[PDB]
Design a protein around this ligand. Sequence first.
Ligand SMILES: [K+]
Ligand SMILES: [K+]
Ligand SMILES: [K+]
Ligand SMILES: [K+]
Ligand SMILES: [Mg+2]
Ligand SMILES: [Mg+2]
Ligand SMILES: [Mg+2]
Ligand SMILES: [Zn+2]
Ligand SMILES: [Zn+2]
Lengths: 348, 346
Amino acid sequence: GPLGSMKTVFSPLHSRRHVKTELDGGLLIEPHEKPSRAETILARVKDQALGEILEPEEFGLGPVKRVHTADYVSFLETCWDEWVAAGKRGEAIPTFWVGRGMRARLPKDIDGRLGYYSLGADTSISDGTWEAARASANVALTAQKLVAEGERAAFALCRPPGHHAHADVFGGYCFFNNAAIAAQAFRDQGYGKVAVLDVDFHHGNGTQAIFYDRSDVLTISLHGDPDLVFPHFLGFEDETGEGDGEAYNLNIVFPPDTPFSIWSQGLEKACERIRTFAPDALVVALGVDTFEEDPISFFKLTSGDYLKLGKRLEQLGLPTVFTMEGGYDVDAIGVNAVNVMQGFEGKS
Amino acid sequence: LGSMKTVFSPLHSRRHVKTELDGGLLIEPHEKPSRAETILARVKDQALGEILEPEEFGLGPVKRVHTADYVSFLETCWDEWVAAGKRGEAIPTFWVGRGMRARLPKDIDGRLGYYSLGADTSISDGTWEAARASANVALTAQKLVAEGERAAFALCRPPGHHAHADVFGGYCFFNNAAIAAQAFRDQGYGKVAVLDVDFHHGNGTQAIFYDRSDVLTISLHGDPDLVFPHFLGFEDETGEGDGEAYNLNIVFPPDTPFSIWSQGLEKACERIRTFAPDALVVALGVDTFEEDPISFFKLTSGDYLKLGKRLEQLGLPTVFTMEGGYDVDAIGVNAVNVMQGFEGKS
Ligand SMILES: [K+]
Ligand SMILES: [K+]
Ligand SMILES: [K+]
Ligand SMILES: [K+]
Ligand SMILES: [Mg+2]
Ligand SMILES: [Mg+2]
Ligand SMILES: [Mg+2]
Ligand SMILES: [Zn+2]
Ligand SMILES: [Zn+2]
């Protein structure tokens, strides 16, 4: 496509995930991660003529299982059917989990397995969750293929998001780690080193965990202080990797009310870390829940700041896949996410 | 025929939560105040023995079992929850998933998950007061036995046996049975056995004494592959370190009746005989009952008389702590039948 354009991959199958309940503050509420998020971004991609929009190819479970365990993939496929067959009347929500002092032992019971495979209770599973998660991973893999076959960049309009999912744990509205799947696909195709930069408001705990003992995939996240927000139990600045991965994970933490003038100092530190890592490809886990009107987050970026973010990311000079993560003010989510892509393409 | 004293606190009614997460829905809680009131009414109706209010022992004996940080959390959780703007009862949303750090966070939601093993045990106003009262009920029962009674009935509510040193869940906050067992040890009883006949595994009691040989922990329960607590309670868990061979789990499948369950009871009694303890704590649940709404054994009301009789034959100073049992219209008959069987009713 012409200079100033970027392709977007989008699957209509995201609408197969449309849960009705989310545990929040002790109540079952309307979920934050709703289908209109993807539809609003897509409409803005079309309205601004960002570039070609294409549906994903089907890559099968192979590339997903380069990152996720077979038992976990099997669990996600059967969980809903087993839940209904066991007589439960609500959506599939964990009630019990492996508390501190208990065994990490897989039980037969579906409630037990729900808790074994989860890190939170705000991510209901229902009919179509499996199909939407599969399509979202294929969206990311199709974007990776576009870039591997010649595009400078591509936008993977993933829903559900991915960066909170571990090799065998779901939560934070995520099931398959689309960013990690794209990064591993780059590695499997002969890209020697890959960086994953997580600019979503929340820590990419799943991505950090998946590559934690590796030096061939650099993981960086900017996020709200986990002492104060999800995911609470990872994301601290003292987590720098393990074994061969020591010095190849970087967390940058910010307090409530942080604006772009401060957040972008952390962005500059992340970009300098990417420069010294010198990767062959970049995956950006993009959330716009850093926005000043986001209902669940406490940074203060403006819509115009997303143009600046995209410009700065283009200056890294790397083949780049963007995977859509969070962002919950639906009025502005399309403007904000597409502003990143437009800034990358030279707008403003 | 014989008499047994019962300790009961009216402060149990301070815990009266409205919601329990169950099957993806917020339902009426199973662990409800009428459980304790129905048992107490039957204790009075049968003239089992004197009924006493608990003494206030303070937090010393509780902190012999539970960590100071956990005890502090339980006192402030509800106030912090309300001040943070939450509109429901206090229920964990996130926890330490496999692969995350066991690191205590500042946030109240984060601490709720750190200190819990499940989301079915809502916290609200008065939970702290009722949990403190329930531990005092167990400690008063232990005092009665140490001062000469053969046995005493601690009519605890909330129950206790699923609580670890620093984890609440399964309707439990303080491990009343563990607190009573440790009180026996602290008063010079060299060996103590804790026998858990509740339908569910006493995972908290197991964890608290797991590396210890001075407190023998035995539980009969439904197979954790199939029921709470799922991640402890298996027969291969026999202890750790010096505690090796001082934990015994006996597991049964759905539909198990007393004629089979009592064979496991006999194996537990033989292990207790060779251990030869100086005191016995029985974590007593009657959710082994054939009509219990969340459990799958098939004991009848008359079987609880036989259970009480068999426990008396151990010949030990015995504290009964009330745990589960959720078929309310039979809970009084069932629980008091254990005490009356202990005293000689058949
Ligand atoms: K982030
Ligand atoms: K790494
Ligand atoms: K038991
Ligand atoms: K033990
Ligand atoms: Mg179950
Ligand atoms: Mg919070
Ligand atoms: Mg009944
Ligand atoms: Zn986010
Ligand atoms: Zn029970």
